[PDB]
Amino acid sequence: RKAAGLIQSIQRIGSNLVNRAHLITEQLTSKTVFLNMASFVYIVFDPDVERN
Amino acid sequence: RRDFHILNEAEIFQLLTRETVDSFRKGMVIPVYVRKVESSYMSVSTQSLIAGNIQRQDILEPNDRRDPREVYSVGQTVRACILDVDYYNFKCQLSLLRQFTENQVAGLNVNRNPKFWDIESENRDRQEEIDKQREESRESRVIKHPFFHNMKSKEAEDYLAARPVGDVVIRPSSKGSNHITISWKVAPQLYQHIDVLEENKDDANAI
Amino acid sequence: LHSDDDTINSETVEIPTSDLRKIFNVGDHVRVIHGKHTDDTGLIVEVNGDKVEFISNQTKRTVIVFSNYLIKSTDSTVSINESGRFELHDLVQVNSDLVGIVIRAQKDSFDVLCSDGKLLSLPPVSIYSKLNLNPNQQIAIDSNGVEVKVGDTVREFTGERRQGTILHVYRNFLFLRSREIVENQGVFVTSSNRVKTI
Amino acid sequence: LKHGTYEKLDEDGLIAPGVRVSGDDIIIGKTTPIPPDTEELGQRTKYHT
Amino acid sequence: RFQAYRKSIKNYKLSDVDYSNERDWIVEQLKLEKRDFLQHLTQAHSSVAHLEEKFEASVKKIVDFIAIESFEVPFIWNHRRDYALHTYNDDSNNTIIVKLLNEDDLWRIVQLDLDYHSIHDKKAALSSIYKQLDLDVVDPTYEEFFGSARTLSELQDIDDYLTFNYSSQVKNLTS
Amino acid sequence: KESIRRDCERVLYFQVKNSFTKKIDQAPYQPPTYAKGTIPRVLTLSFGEGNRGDAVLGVFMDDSGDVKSQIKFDEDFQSRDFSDSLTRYIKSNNINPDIIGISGFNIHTKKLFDKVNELVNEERLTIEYDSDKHLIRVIYVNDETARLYQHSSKSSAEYPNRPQLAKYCIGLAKYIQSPLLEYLALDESMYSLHI
Amino acid sequence: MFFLKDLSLILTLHPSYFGPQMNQYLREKLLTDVEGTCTGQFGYIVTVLDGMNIDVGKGRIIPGSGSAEFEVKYRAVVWKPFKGEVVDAIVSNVSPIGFFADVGPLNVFVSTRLIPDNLVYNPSNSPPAYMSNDELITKGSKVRLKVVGTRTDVNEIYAIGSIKEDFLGAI
Amino acid sequence: ELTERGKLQIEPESPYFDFKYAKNRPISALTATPDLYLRMIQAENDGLVNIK
Amino acid sequence: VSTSTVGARRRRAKQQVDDEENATLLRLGPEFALKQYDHDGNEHDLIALSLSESRLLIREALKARSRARNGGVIDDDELAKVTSGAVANGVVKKTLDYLNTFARFKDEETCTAVDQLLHNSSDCSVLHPFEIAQLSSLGCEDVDEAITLIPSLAAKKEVNLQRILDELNRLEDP
RNA sequence: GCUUGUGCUGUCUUCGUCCA
């Protein structure tokens, strides 16, 4: 149930998650749930896209 | 993760046949569909399409001398005992001899240790099961004859008591349906029972 | 109408259907008209006004369906034809090394009797495949050495000494159909070595 | 197909004069097309049309 | 998954004394279940003293993580592995790592955490029944086999003892 | 009796868990000269039951997970025509398999496996990255999940115009590309497997 | 509830059994086909009174098949549950969905929705049970339940009980 | 020990034949082979055998 | 399988409310009606049986059959094994266990006294036989308990229920 | 290694055959 809520929240915000911290700053997840799930979900980083 | 698993001979055999290498091995007995009959070899197909083979020394009994063609026919199905399995080529060798097909019954390695198995109770139960397999069916015999009466020996003697000397009565014998006892009055309160053996009987109730 | 007065109970009144609501009493056989649980029957357990709860007959579990979808049918008489992928008494491969025979069939489930005797309840999708064995493969050999084909009646000698007619053959196991064993609609599994042909 | 024989027909589906014919034997071979079944699941040369 | 496991628990938040008893109970249960592993640890690592004390401390820390911090098994296994293993330097300055717990043991600790709450509820009910009995002098047998009781079978035995020997008070409160 | 039952149930639970862990712990097949975990390009073949009538159906899946160029062969697989068709199919510029997977319903699949392996070895059909050259690998594929996939309504909705054997080939290719997700796609049906 | 009923059975006999022991063979066939059977119309037939002295009459030869048809009338003890009846029972199995009891040969299933809430199911208990503060019902425990609904099968009867009313539950 | 049902229906084909006449099996060794004791219990539930 | 002595019952148009089985309303259906007919067509009353009467009858019939089958030469298990049919053996075993574990009267004379008290009584001359069987079977202790368990007895308030229950408890062996 | 396939229209009209 939490996965479907997370997917719907991401699709509301724009179907793209820029940063891991946005699971907390955008109120998408709670503190302990994020603390559990932070290192097991990842965002592919492309150096050509992020020069900064 | 670990590397992609690549199937071995046993896994390929289990995949393609759905028979494990445990339930299909040396010594087991299975029914096989005969397909070819020759003078020296026989080719059969098992239930899972594994092509079998039997040689001349494994088709016929040692005391037999008839040709293999006369003994078996194409399309017949028989019991055979596995002598070798080739798990890579899906081929097996079998034997139709009595020593292999029937004697090998205890195919499981049950731990029959005397301290860990109730040997005597098993023997008693098995003996009782054989004593129940010895049970048979039986019924009385009916014969149509004017001087025949379905009576016992003492009953026949009592029946002949009311009749004078020389009258004859016929009763079934205790030795079986193939025997007939004829009782005739020798003297007052003296009777002779004579057993008659029947040959070339058309039926048990027939004469 | 039904009322405490006898003189009122002997009167028939014609009433429009637009002002009638069905009354469902606890412990009545009812068959579902329409919905996801269509053609499910069972006994009413709880009547929460508009919503009615009943223990099913097929799934044997409580199902909550609205009262508008219920008809009082005292008998199920559900036909399972034109459903699933499996006729009754089909020899179905459950998985890689498991097989069985369909004993009872349902709209979205099946009852399978294993070769060893264990009964299973599975959805149709979970069944691995259906074994369409050839007629030559569907032949076995009794304890005497006499061939026994499908439809041949045989009777055991070991064990309980039961009797039945051959329904399916798998390896050394014979699936037999019998009149007196009502426990599994006559279907009991025995090895061919245990039987003698009649 | 029918229970009779078809080996007495020629390539054009017609029997030739001078041939012996018994009851039920096929003397004129004719076929009509039929929209094929789901046999396009794979039947290399044995799908009925 | 923790919510699904704890959905049947009437009350999960234990007091401090009950929580310490829970930790001790889980340590004892793991000691009982992992006897062969502890024997192998003691025999093959004889040079290191008091490894079983380190095992007890590690099990208590894992119970602390699971109960208070509510960490699930993969997170503990990945990011808290230093509490699940012990390291030492031998006489030859050899760095040796000993793995006290594995992932299956973490799942077993979760299972024991779930299991102990039924024991706690049964013990609380039995103590409440004893309070309603209101003995003038504390029964030495009851306290003796209530302090050491660690399975619900012994609690049931104490319940049978209490309802037999003090049946009159039970009848008065209420065969 | 209850205590021993509970203990034995715990032990059997952990044994079943370890067996299932051994089942699902598989990485995707690693093509040579490529880093582990890279999704390969897969070609799968199967005639089905192996009978006289049954034709061979092929499905090619690229590393992006898109099914490309399903084909049907209209000749006996023991003939030279099937070998020529397969050689033309594999050597086509638009198809570049990294591995060839084969699975089937009975022992006739061994003949197909041997035929494809002999054809690949004799013709020296090498992997086309379009230096060192490596022949394409031919393996048997465990079809635990494909047989349930071919009947699933999700597969039918995904590919309405395709037969069951095409869905079986797609299931085999998907299993080669990602075993874990193929096990996950079974949903309630994965408890009925032989664990 | 048990009753005495006058029942009848139609017995067909093959001509191969036309012997002096025809009456006794018909008696044993009737006993095997009646003792222990379950008919939804009648309930459960447990025993047949005077089983060795039942009149069988004269059998009628069926035209075109040779076999004789016998009309056998007998008195037997029959048990059948009724809707809205309270009877005793013994619990045979405990499950989260409810408990299964046995009333002779009949098995009665009671769902949790017909069980009072204070009898909370305890799966950790040895053996598992539906227990309350003052009540504990497990396998083999005497229970008094009221039959609410009866389900009739081809040769089987399924009953549903309830314990939510007074003078029910543990006894 | 075997009931009458167990005395008849326990055939070599059956999985319960392994422990049909077992004795002197210690409790300490049961946990090594959980399937054996589970099969014993399941046979008991069928009314075939009795574990003493 | 077995057919009742009551036949006919052809199609009509009227529908009645006294057709559904209901113990509380004392509507036992046509096949269990208060008036029955024997093989001779004579009038016959519905024969209810309490667990004591049923147990006595089944024990008597079973021991008579066992004696007859043995050439005229007590254990429940052997007596059940006398009967034929594995499913029949299981059914008779279950009934024997149920009757044994709930036998209110294991003596013939006590059962005879109970039957005479429940039949020859003036108040019980109006009582339905099903009510008599329920009272002798369930072993109720209170008038209110009997009324709650047996709703039919609520409408029959001219019955000395309490003293009959106390006599039944007295006759019941403690 | 290779195996054999399993059925039939309807409705009118006309002309005939053996009696009557």
Tab-separated table of N, CA and C in Angstrom, chain G residues 98-151:
chain	number	residue	atom	x	y	z
G	98	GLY	N	-13.189	-19.608	12.333
G	98	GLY	CA	-14.194	-20.195	13.190
G	98	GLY	C	-13.764	-21.583	13.621
G	99	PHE	N	-14.679	-22.279	14.286
G	99	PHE	CA	-14.400	-23.608	14.803
G	99	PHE	C	-15.358	-24.622	14.193
G	100	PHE	N	-14.859	-25.840	14.018
G	100	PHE	CA	-15.623	-26.939	13.449
G	100	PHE	C	-15.939	-27.931	14.557
G	101	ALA	N	-17.218	-28.252	14.711
G	101	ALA	CA	-17.671	-29.200	15.713
G	101	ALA	C	-18.272	-30.421	15.033
G	102	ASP	N	-18.472	-31.474	15.821
G	102	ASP	CA	-19.054	-32.718	15.339
G	102	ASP	C	-20.269	-33.070	16.181
G	103	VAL	N	-21.401	-33.270	15.521
G	103	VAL	CA	-22.622	-33.738	16.167
G	103	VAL	C	-22.913	-35.094	15.537
G	104	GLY	N	-22.391	-36.154	16.150
G	104	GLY	CA	-22.405	-37.466	15.553
G	104	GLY	C	-21.638	-37.486	14.246
G	105	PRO	N	-22.269	-38.000	13.188
G	105	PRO	CA	-21.630	-37.966	11.865
G	105	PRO	C	-21.657	-36.594	11.217
G	106	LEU	N	-22.514	-35.690	11.688
G	106	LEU	CA	-22.642	-34.368	11.096
G	106	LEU	C	-21.553	-33.442	11.623
G	107	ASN	N	-20.944	-32.685	10.715
G	107	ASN	CA	-19.950	-31.678	11.062
G	107	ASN	C	-20.575	-30.301	10.889
G	108	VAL	N	-20.534	-29.498	11.950
G	108	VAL	CA	-21.165	-28.185	11.982
G	108	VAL	C	-20.072	-27.129	12.037
G	109	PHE	N	-20.169	-26.131	11.165
G	109	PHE	CA	-19.204	-25.041	11.091
G	109	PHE	C	-19.848	-23.766	11.617
G	110	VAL	N	-19.168	-23.107	12.555
G	110	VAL	CA	-19.620	-21.844	13.127
G	110	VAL	C	-18.582	-20.781	12.800
G	111	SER	N	-19.006	-19.730	12.102
G	111	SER	CA	-18.099	-18.649	11.754
G	111	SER	C	-17.949	-17.683	12.925
G	112	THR	N	-16.889	-16.869	12.861
G	112	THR	CA	-16.610	-15.891	13.912
G	112	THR	C	-17.707	-14.840	14.029
G	113	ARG	N	-18.397	-14.536	12.927
G	113	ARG	CA	-19.491	-13.571	12.946
G	113	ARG	C	-20.707	-14.060	13.725
G	114	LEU	N	-20.761	-15.344	14.078
G	114	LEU	CA	-21.786	-15.893	14.955
G	114	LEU	C	-21.224	-16.266	16.325
G	115	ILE	N	-20.027	-15.788	16.653
G	115	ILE	CA	-19.373	-16.049	17.934
G	115	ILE	C	-19.265	-14.727	18.683
G	116	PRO	N	-19.531	-14.704	19.995
G	116	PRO	CA	-19.336	-13.476	20.777
G	116	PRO	C	-17.888	-12.998	20.751
G	117	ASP	N	-17.731	-11.670	20.785
G	117	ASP	CA	-16.428	-11.038	20.588
G	117	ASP	C	-15.451	-11.319	21.721
G	118	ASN	N	-15.942	-11.498	22.953
G	118	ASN	CA	-15.055	-11.744	24.089
G	118	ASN	C	-14.316	-13.076	23.984
G	119	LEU	N	-14.831	-14.030	23.206
G	119	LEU	CA	-14.155	-15.309	22.980
G	119	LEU	C	-13.133	-15.149	21.852
G	120	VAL	N	-12.082	-14.386	22.156
G	120	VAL	CA	-11.042	-14.082	21.179
G	120	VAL	C	-10.240	-15.340	20.873
G	121	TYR	N	-10.025	-15.601	19.583
G	121	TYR	CA	-9.214	-16.739	19.165
G	121	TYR	C	-7.754	-16.512	19.536
G	122	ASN	N	-7.168	-17.481	20.236
G	122	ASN	CA	-5.765	-17.409	20.637
G	122	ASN	C	-4.988	-18.475	19.876
G	123	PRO	N	-4.253	-18.115	18.818
G	123	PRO	CA	-3.470	-19.125	18.091
G	123	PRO	C	-2.189	-19.528	18.800
G	124	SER	N	-1.685	-18.699	19.719
G	124	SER	CA	-0.480	-19.035	20.466
G	124	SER	C	-0.737	-20.091	21.533
G	125	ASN	N	-1.988	-20.249	21.967
G	125	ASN	CA	-2.333	-21.223	22.994
G	125	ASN	C	-2.060	-22.641	22.499
G	126	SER	N	-1.758	-23.529	23.441
G	126	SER	CA	-1.467	-24.930	23.138
G	126	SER	C	-2.486	-25.806	23.850
G	127	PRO	N	-3.505	-26.326	23.150
G	127	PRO	CA	-3.815	-26.163	21.720
G	127	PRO	C	-4.517	-24.829	21.426
G	128	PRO	N	-4.530	-24.363	20.169
G	128	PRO	CA	-5.197	-23.090	19.849
G	128	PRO	C	-6.677	-23.115	20.208
G	129	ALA	N	-7.180	-21.971	20.670
G	129	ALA	CA	-8.511	-21.939	21.250
G	129	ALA	C	-9.147	-20.572	21.071
G	130	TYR	N	-10.472	-20.545	21.232
G	130	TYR	CA	-11.244	-19.314	21.344
G	130	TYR	C	-11.546	-19.121	22.827
G	131	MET	N	-10.846	-18.187	23.463
G	131	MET	CA	-10.891	-18.053	24.909
G	131	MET	C	-11.371	-16.668	25.317
G	132	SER	N	-11.986	-16.610	26.497
G	132	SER	CA	-12.399	-15.363	27.119
G	132	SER	C	-11.803	-15.295	28.517
G	133	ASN	N	-12.255	-14.334	29.326
G	133	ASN	CA	-11.775	-14.226	30.701
G	133	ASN	C	-12.164	-15.450	31.524
G	134	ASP	N	-13.427	-15.870	31.435
G	134	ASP	CA	-13.929	-16.995	32.213
G	134	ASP	C	-14.238	-18.232	31.377
G	135	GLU	N	-14.063	-18.177	30.059
G	135	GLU	CA	-14.388	-19.292	29.178
G	135	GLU	C	-13.187	-19.641	28.313
G	136	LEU	N	-13.015	-20.937	28.054
G	136	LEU	CA	-11.917	-21.422	27.224
G	136	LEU	C	-12.427	-22.625	26.442
G	137	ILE	N	-12.572	-22.465	25.129
G	137	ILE	CA	-13.120	-23.503	24.262
G	137	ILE	C	-12.032	-23.918	23.281
G	138	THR	N	-11.637	-25.190	23.342
G	138	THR	CA	-10.607	-25.728	22.461
G	138	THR	C	-11.053	-27.061	21.875
G	139	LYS	N	-10.136	-27.766	21.214
G	139	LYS	CA	-10.418	-29.094	20.678
G	139	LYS	C	-10.827	-30.058	21.787
G	140	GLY	N	-11.919	-30.783	21.560
G	140	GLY	CA	-12.426	-31.739	22.520
G	140	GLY	C	-13.265	-31.164	23.641
G	141	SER	N	-13.523	-29.859	23.641
G	141	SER	CA	-14.304	-29.227	24.696
G	141	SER	C	-15.790	-29.282	24.366
G	142	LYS	N	-16.597	-29.570	25.385
G	142	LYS	CA	-18.045	-29.620	25.215
G	142	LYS	C	-18.588	-28.226	24.919
G	143	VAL	N	-19.410	-28.122	23.876
G	143	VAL	CA	-20.028	-26.860	23.475
G	143	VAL	C	-21.501	-27.104	23.179
G	144	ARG	N	-22.335	-26.132	23.538
G	144	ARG	CA	-23.757	-26.151	23.234
G	144	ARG	C	-24.045	-25.049	22.223
G	145	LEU	N	-24.478	-25.440	21.024
G	145	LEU	CA	-24.702	-24.500	19.936
G	145	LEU	C	-26.096	-24.693	19.356
G	146	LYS	N	-26.587	-23.649	18.697
G	146	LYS	CA	-27.905	-23.652	18.078
G	146	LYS	C	-27.748	-23.681	16.566
G	147	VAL	N	-28.382	-24.661	15.925
G	147	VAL	CA	-28.293	-24.803	14.476
G	147	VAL	C	-29.153	-23.728	13.822
G	148	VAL	N	-28.539	-22.926	12.960
G	148	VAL	CA	-29.222	-21.829	12.281
G	148	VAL	C	-29.610	-22.207	10.858
G	149	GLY	N	-28.677	-22.752	10.096
G	149	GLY	CA	-28.948	-23.121	8.720
G	149	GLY	C	-28.405	-24.501	8.410
G	150	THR	N	-29.083	-25.178	7.486
G	150	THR	CA	-28.699	-26.511	7.040
G	150	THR	C	-28.544	-26.499	5.528
G	151	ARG	N	-27.424	-27.027	5.045
G	151	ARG	CA	-27.137	-27.108	3.621
G	151	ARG	C	-27.192	-28.563	3.179
